[PDB]
Write a protein that binds this ligand. Structure first.
Ligand SMILES: Nc1nccn2c(NCc3ccccc3)c(Cc3cc4c(cc3Br)OCO4)nc12
Length: 209
């Protein structure tokens, strides 16, 4: 059962800008997704202090980076708080609308795309390198969902039948054909060292073959 939803105009506009603007410093997408993961990990950790049962779905708090050259995907996996269906369909949109408006304005106080994370919409920088983004997510007390969008003004949400995750979020970046450098081990290592050196959770870069 696949449901299809329209983005609000503001977010559709932001995604178009990110896809259509000439901007060479694309590597910042990874910093933004890892930062999101760290925030999600902070949240489940904090909640677990008052309710330890919230870690029954997995006690390990980490981030894995998984390149797959055959699929042409880079996946950012975390065991953070995860997202509910209401998050994916309603709440994200509400938050993202205001953040987009501010970011658009700031871009006309001369700001540059690399400051996107300060407006809470850093996720969408994924579209600097990805033609399609699939997000698999599992929050305690809700089902596992797959969100997906190739931009163009719509996204889908479905109940996910893949491998159960326990708790957390996987962001699967289906890379543009000219952005395959982000599947290379030394390139990913370079970016993590440069932008994400002090994240307070283990980041494991998986290797390939
Ligand atoms: N790795 C993550 N784990 C948990 C929540 N996450 C969010 N959402 C924070 C949030 C939730 C509800 C309301 C407001 C903010 C994003 C960031 C994110 C993830 C997305 C997305 C848009 C955004 Br912003 O569309 C598909 O997935 N990444 C994560």
């Amino acid at each position: 059962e696949v449901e299809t939803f329209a983005f609000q105009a503001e977010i559709a506009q932001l995604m178009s800008l990110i896809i259509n603007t000439f901007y060479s410093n694309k590597e910042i997408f990874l910093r933004e997704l890892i930062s999101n993961s760290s925030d999600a990990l902070d949240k489940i950790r904090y909640e677990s202090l008052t309710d330890p049962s919230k870690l029954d779905s997995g006690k390990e708090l980490h981030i894995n980076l998984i390149p797959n050259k055959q699929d042409r995907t880079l996946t950012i996996v975390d065991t953070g708080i995860g997202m509910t269906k209401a998050d994916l369909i309603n709440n994200l949109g509400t938050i993202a609308k205001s953040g987009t408006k501010a970011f658009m304005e700031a871009l006309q106080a001369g700001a540059d795309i690399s400051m996107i994370g300060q407006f809470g919409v850093g996720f969408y920088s994924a579209y600097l390198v990805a033609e399609k983004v699939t997000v698999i997510t599992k929050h305690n007390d809700d089902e596992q969902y797959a969100w997906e969008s190739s931009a163009g003004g719509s996204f889908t949400v479905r109940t996910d039948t893949g491998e159960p995750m326990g708790r957390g979020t996987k962001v699967i970046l289906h890379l543009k054909e000219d952005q395959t450098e982000y599947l290379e081990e030394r390139r990913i290592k370079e970016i993590v060292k440069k932008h994400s050196q002090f994240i307070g959770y283990p980041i494991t870069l998986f290797v390939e073959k």
